[PDB]
Write a protein that binds this ligand. Structure first.
Ligand code: NK0
Length: 326
């Protein structure tokens, strides 16, 4: 049942795709490919040297596993996976095909409507609810891995894999609430058009992050663990928690309330993805009957730290066995 493939040299690499797909422009490297089968615009990704290190081989089995498992309206889904290789010992290339959306949330920023922010933030949180229910953290949610079409249907890309310190959670710079800090950072920018914390250095970010949320209180200074984390907080000036209204001028009161609860340093007391959906701000979008959870993902392969050759064969079988969904 193997069809026929074709070569093309792009950006110093050889894209070897079947006849089924045509035209490949960069949008490792992801091409904007036009389908001739369903006549849609599919996303075609060719990975960065998939098995040329032990981690690359693991980041490949995980990515393909994560994708052949997630099934949610706001989470990228796998349509196809292929290899130009005819056998197992010739398998060194992996291709992943999804749906291609318009652009990203970084591209839709601009002064945004509170109802347009309502609909995107709701989609992000509903997408995280189905991701978190399968025990997975994005850890680097930025508007660039939040793809949107023309109708504002949103899909989360690049979950569970990984100027740059802009959206990182304080406790990580552990807990699913790491992505809730990123959600608040995107929402703040959508409501205005200004990066809440656009810091350059690792330390400066923490000084900018604590400039709005305040300095960690007596309760948290006891909760805190790390010596350098303790000896940096006590080395930086005393800062009180700022009023969100004073910075979030004109914004919907229920939008100012969510962000205040979202952007707290306390991980044990940070609003969850499931909890944030039933919040007053999303009263129009919320519906408990159409908010799906995830069918258990076999994360047993993580505790294993085997050899390249073993990862490759596991990745090999998930490609052969793959059944294309309607
Ligand atoms: C093809 C592909 C493979 C894997 C994953 C992905 O998450 N695996 C993680 C393990 C979860 C995601 C994708 N898909 C995209 N991966 C990167 N970039 N990318 C841009 C788009 C656009 O639709 C788009 C189009 C024009 C401009 C901007 C954006 C799309 C859909 C993707």
């Amino acid at each position: 049942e193997r069809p026929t493939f074709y070569r093309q040299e792009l950006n110093k690499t050889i894209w070897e795709v079947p006849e089924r797909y045509q035209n490949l422009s960069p949008v490792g490297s992801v091409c904007a490919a036009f389908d001739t089968k369903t006549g849609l615009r599919v996303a075609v990704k060719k990975l960065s040297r998939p098995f040329q290190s032990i981690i690359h081989a693991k980041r490949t089995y995980r990515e393909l596993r994560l994708l052949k498992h997630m099934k949610h309206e706001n989470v990228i889904g796998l349509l196809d996976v292929f290899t130009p290789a005819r056998s197992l010992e010739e398998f060194n290339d992996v291709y992943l095909v999804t749906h291609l959306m318009g652009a990203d949330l970084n591209n839709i920023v601009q002064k945004l409507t509170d109802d347009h922010v309502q609909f995107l933030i709701y989609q992000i949180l509903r997408g995280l609810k189905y991701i978190h229910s399968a025990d997975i953290i994005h850890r680097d949610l930025k508007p660039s891995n939040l793809a949107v079409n023309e109708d504002c249907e949103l899909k989360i890309l690049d979950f569970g894999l990984a100027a740059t310190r802009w959206y990182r959670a304080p406790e990580i710079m552990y807990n699913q609430t790491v992505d809730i800090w990123s959600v608040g950072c995107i929402m703040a920018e959508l409501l205005t058009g200004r990066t809440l914390f656009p810091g350059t250095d690792h330390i400066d970010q923490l000084k900018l992050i604590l400039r709005l949320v305040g300095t960690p209180g007596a309760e948290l200074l006891k909760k805190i663990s790390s010596e350098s984390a303790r000896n940096y907080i006590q080395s930086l000036t005393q800062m009180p928690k700022m009023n969100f209204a004073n910075v979030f001028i004109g914004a919907n009161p229920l939008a100012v309330d969510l962000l205040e609860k979202m952007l707290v340093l306390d991980s044990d007391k940070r609003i969850t993805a499931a909890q944030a959906l039933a919040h007053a701000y999303f009263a129009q979008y919320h519906d408990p009957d159409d908010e799906p959870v995830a069918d258990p993902y076999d994360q047993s392969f993580e505790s294993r730290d085997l050899l390249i050759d073993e990862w490759k064969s596991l990745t090999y079988d998930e490609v052969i066995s793959f059944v294309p969904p309607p």
